[PDB]
Amino acid sequence: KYRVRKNVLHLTDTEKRDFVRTVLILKEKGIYDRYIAWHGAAGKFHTPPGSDRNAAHMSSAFLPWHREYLLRFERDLQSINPEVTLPYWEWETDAQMQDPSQSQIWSADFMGGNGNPIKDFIVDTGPFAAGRWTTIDEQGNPSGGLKRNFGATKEAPTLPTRDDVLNALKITQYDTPPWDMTSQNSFRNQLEGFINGPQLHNRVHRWVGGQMGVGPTAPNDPVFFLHHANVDRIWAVWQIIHRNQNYQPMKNGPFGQNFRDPMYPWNTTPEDVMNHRKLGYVYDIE
Ligand SMILES: [Cu+2]
Ligand SMILES: [Cu+2]
């Protein structure tokens, strides 16, 4: 309840400067790379093998997986700078703008801007511009630059709306069998965005483009964590609202998806991260 995750737009220039600096440090130290690989590994871990579901996506573990993932990242920032916490990108408000790409999150002192269509959508502004920040491909080999291409996709010309987010918060069950991308009247499948996809979470990735367009390379873009911080806030808000609801499946789901299963690549369980306050953080909106 001490660490407070703030909205990006409420950040002081110094806070924004300190977040970036710490992320750059994690990168230099070789720590940042551990996160990208954990994510890649996870999406490759199929539950069960042959199934669509994996440890980190397309099933019930989606929400807790990333919560643990973000918890570990924040602790790592914290080891560098005890004053630094993970902010969130409230994409639903930016979506209200005439031109969302005009959001302050993309300023040169923070995330940097859109991709340069002359350099194949390589990002050349900001702290994470090519030549300042090295990227890795799916194979673990250098890929040579952050790429972004906002709203370029026919399927996802726009970010998700405030109404889209409110409509997910109305769903009663955390998830429903068969605990996959076809799960109906499920908050998890809804938020993840497979209901008439891409919506919500999935929709943000498609809208951002570049590495953020494809799962395995998503975290190469530091905006990945800001986005997942916002996703985690929505879940946390749901938990407050539907407080007689609990995680599902409690059992009989596939191994890795149940309440008390370890979440590959770690030993952490969904039970372990069910209460975010217990983890030592809370979002501003409280
Ligand atoms: Cu993920
Ligand atoms: Cu994601």
Side-chain angles (χ1 to χ4, degrees):
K1 316 111 131 41
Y2 273 37
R3 268 176 294 160
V4 65
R5 274 131 99 126
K6 305 187 177 195
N7 185 320
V8 162
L9 301 181
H10 297 173
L11 287 174
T12 67
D13 280 345
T14 140
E15 287 178 306
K16 280 186 285 203
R17 221 168 193 168
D18 291 324
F19 179 79
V20 168
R21 221 84 172 184
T22 309
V23 166
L24 294 172
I25 289 161
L26 255 45
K27 187 70 190 172
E28 200 289 318
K29 293 192 166 309
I31 302 185
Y32 192 101
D33 292 337
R34 293 168 59 75
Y35 292 86
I36 321 171
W38 269 342
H39 192 271
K44 251 189 157 89
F45 195 78
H46 295 294
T47 73
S51 172
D52 240 350
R53 318 175 187 93
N54 59 256
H57 311 94
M58 292 177 72
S59 185
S60 300
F62 173 57
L63 289 170
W65 198 94
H66 292 86
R67 181 171 285 174
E68 171 72 348
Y69 182 83
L70 297 182
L71 184 38
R72 286 159 105 94
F73 192 69
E74 187 174 63
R75 300 211 163 129
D76 278 12
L77 300 173
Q78 215 94 45
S79 284
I80 306 320
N81 198 141
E83 288 293 314
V84 175
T85 56
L86 220 208
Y88 61 89
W89 176 20
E90 178 176 74
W91 25 256
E92 59 265 44
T93 51
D94 285 6
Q96 293 191 302
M97 299 169 67
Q98 220 331 288
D99 201 328
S101 58
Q102 276 196 341
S103 174
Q104 276 179 338
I105 178 171
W106 310 122
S107 82
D109 63 29
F110 199 58
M111 291 301 86
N114 211 169
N116 191 160
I118 301 303
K119 319 144 96 73
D120 310 359
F121 297 105
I122 284 294
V123 174
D124 49 333
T125 54
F128 311 107
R132 283 203 274 290
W133 177 267
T134 49
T135 49
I136 260 71
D137 66 24
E138 182 192 314
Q139 314 164 172
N141 302 309
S143 59
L146 207 211
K147 290 169 164 185
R148 288 179 191 143
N149 190 182
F150 303 152
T153 246
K154 167 175 172 289
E155 215 146 304
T158 177
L159 292 168
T161 67
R162 190 169 177 281
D163 279 338
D164 297 351
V165 171
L166 257 42
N167 290 332
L169 292 176
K170 284 173 196 170
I171 306 289
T172 295
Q173 304 276 98
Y174 171 85
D175 210 1
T176 50
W179 328 102
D180 56 20
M181 65 179 273
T182 65
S183 294
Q184 300 300 106
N185 279 78
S186 153
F187 166 73
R188 187 280 311 161
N189 200 39
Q190 261 284 69
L191 207 205
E192 184 166 15
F194 291 98
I195 307 310
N196 313 66
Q199 294 308 144
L200 296 163
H201 163 266
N202 289 173
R203 172 177 278 257
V204 173
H205 284 281
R206 315 287 294 277
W207 185 93
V208 173
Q211 278 91 356
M212 276 274 295
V214 309
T217 56
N220 276 289
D221 186 323
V223 96
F224 176 95
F225 298 86
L226 266 37
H227 169 231
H228 275 272
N230 195 45
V231 175
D232 185 62
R233 170 185 68 92
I234 309 292
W235 182 20
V237 154
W238 188 84
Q239 294 186 277
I240 287 308
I241 284 172
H242 306 270
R243 218 163 333 185
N244 289 136
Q245 291 299 318
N246 214 318
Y247 185 87
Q248 293 178 73
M250 292 292 309
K251 58 134 59 185
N252 306 145
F255 184 61
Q257 298 305 149
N258 298 110
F259 190 59
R260 300 168 191 287
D261 296 347
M263 291 180 305
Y264 180 94
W266 311 297
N267 293 142
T268 321
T269 75
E271 183 188 9
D272 279 336
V273 288
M274 265 321 264
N275 162 31
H276 72 106
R277 198 129 61 170
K278 235 56 172 301
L279 311 180
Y281 75 86
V282 61
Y283 290 94
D284 59 0
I285 48 118
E286 69 152 79

